[PDB]
Design a protein around this ligand. Structure first.
Ligand SMILES: Nc1nc2c(ncn2[C@@H]2O[C@H](COP(=O)(O)OP(=O)(O)OP(=O)(O)O)[C@@H](O)[C@H]2O)c(=O)[nH]1
Length: 163
């Protein structure tokens, strides 16, 4: 099991293979990043929100989460978008990613990105895009307010709390 900031993950399936790549991100800077290749699925948790994450190389394919405190839902979605290394997430960077840690050093790129988008989720969501919500009975779409809606952040769905 693994941790990516407040994101907690447990592998469900697949294997990732990391390759160092130079990535040209949205603010016109080149970052060196271990890019994970391959299909992978993870149980994911952030605080009280739990879900299933499906990803492939630089692509979040699907994110299924439960209803929870909105701040936990939103952070889970963002952390999953960053963790999946989605190209839309890389392209969403506008500002600088030059955060210093409590030690005077630059955070590593993936941790810059996590810190950046948790701070500027609109830069991510505007870049990410919306699509028609699934109409499968047990799922609904979710907008940037973490409200159920007819449109959803692409690839994200929420389960209803049903007894
Ligand atoms: N897609 C994918 N990402 C992983 C996997 N394992 C670790 N990561 C992520 O890849 C990055 C590098 O993590 P590691 O190789 O485990 O170790 P690290 O380079 O010291 O980085 P940290 O452990 O996060 O401090 C981290 O952001 C992890 O979240 C994996 O199996 N699949």
């Amino acid at each position: 099991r693994q941790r990516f900031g407040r994101l907690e993950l447990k592998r469900i399936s697949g294997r990732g293979f990391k390759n160092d790549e130079e990535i040209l991100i949205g603010n016109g800077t080149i970052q060196k990043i271990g890019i994970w290749d391959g299909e992978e699925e993870f149980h994911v948790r952030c605080g009280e929100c739990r879900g299933i994450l499906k990803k492939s190389q630089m692509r979040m394919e699907k994110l299924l989460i439960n209803s929870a405190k909105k701040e936990d839902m939103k952070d889970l979605i963002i952390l999953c978008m960053v963790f999946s290394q989605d190209t839309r997430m890389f392209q969403g960077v506008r500002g600088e990613i030059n955060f210093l840690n409590r030690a005077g050093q630059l955070l590593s790129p993936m941790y810059q990105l996590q810190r950046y988008f948790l701070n500027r989720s609109n830069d991510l969501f505007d870049q990410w895009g919306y699509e028609e919500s699934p109409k499968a009975s047990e799922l609904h779409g979710i907008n940037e307010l973490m409200n159920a809606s007819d449109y959803t952040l692409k690839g994200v769905v929420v389960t209803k709390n049903v007894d």
